[PDB]
């Protein structure tokens, strides 16, 4: 039941992006608002090497199977950083509660969205290639560094990248839902 699956996937991706956007805004107001962290966060997302469409015209041009594949790769690529985000933050003596609560919900809901996505692919493209190709995040040393400024900047970049990729996943899913179910007549 493709319409029900797409509907639920888009509820999740929009809810995840909302949580990531609020997390980034709360971290920003509370730790980084005063010093050049936004200048430091330029060009440094682990998913940058994926060929992702940058406007709706590139999106429309994407082969449907590869576009769905791409969403799946971005979600699979975030499993590792979300795990460490939550682990690191929960391990603090004084964990900023609102931030931690959002990170744990995103960690949990991303897994569900990836499960919904894998079911979509199964239904729409049953002979997909099951090989994984997603980009590796390896920034745990920078999250764990003692230097409070280098550490805050590492967190800033992680949260800025999360808000961006959660947005892209949501926007790409909405594009695909409308293309698949409605022939781009939503």
- Kindly list the residues in this chain that would bind another protein in the complex (CB under 8 A): 14, 17-18, 21, 38-39, 42-43, 48, 52, 54-56, 59-60, 164, 167-168, 170-171, 174-179, 182, 184-186
* CB of 65 or CB of 179, closer to another protein: 179
* CB of 65 or CB of 164, closer to Na ion: 164
**Any residues with CB less than 8 A from the CB of 20 and at least 6 apart, and which?**
102, 106, 159, 162, 163, 166, 167
Contact 173, 71 (CB under 8 A): yes
Q: Which does 168 bind (CB under 5 to 8 A by kind): another protein, Na ion, none?
A: another protein
Q: How many helices (H) and strands (E) does the chain have?
A: 7, 0
Of residues 49 through 88, those in contact with Na ion by CB under 5 A are 55
The Cβ of residue 77 has, within 10 Å, a number of other Cβ atoms equal to 20
Which of the stretches 8-16, 24-32, 103-111, 159-167 binds Na ion when contact is defined by CB under 5 A? 159-167
Is residue 164 a contact residue for Na ion (CB under 5 A)?
yes
- Taking the C-alpha atoms of residue 54 and residue 57, their distance in angstroms, rounded to an integer, is 8
């Amino acid at each position: 039941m493709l319409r029900d699956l797409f509907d639920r996937a888009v509820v999740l991706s929009a809810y995840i992006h909302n949580l990531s956007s609020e997390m980034f805004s709360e971290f920003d107001k509370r730790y980084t608002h005063g010093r050049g962290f936004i200048t430091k966060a330029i060009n440094s997302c682990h998913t940058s090497s994926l060929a992702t469409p940058e406007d709706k015209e590139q999106a429309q041009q994407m082969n449907q199977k590869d576009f769905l594949s791409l969403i799946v790769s971005i979600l699979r690529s975030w499993n590792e950083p979300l795990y460490h985000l939550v682990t690191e933050v929960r391990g603090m003596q004084e964990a900023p509660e609102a931030i931690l609560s959002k990170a744990v919900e995103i960690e949990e809901q991303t897994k569900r969205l990836l499960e919904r996505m894998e079911l979509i692919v199964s239904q729409v493209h049953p002979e997909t290639k099951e090989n994984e190709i997603y980009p590796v995040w390896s920034g745990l040393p920078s999250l764990q560094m003692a230097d409070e400024e280098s550490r805050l900047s590492a967190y800033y970049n992680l949260l800025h990248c999360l808000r961006r990729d959660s947005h892209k996943i949501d926007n790409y899913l909405k594009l695909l839902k409308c293309r698949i179910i409605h022939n781009n007549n939503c």
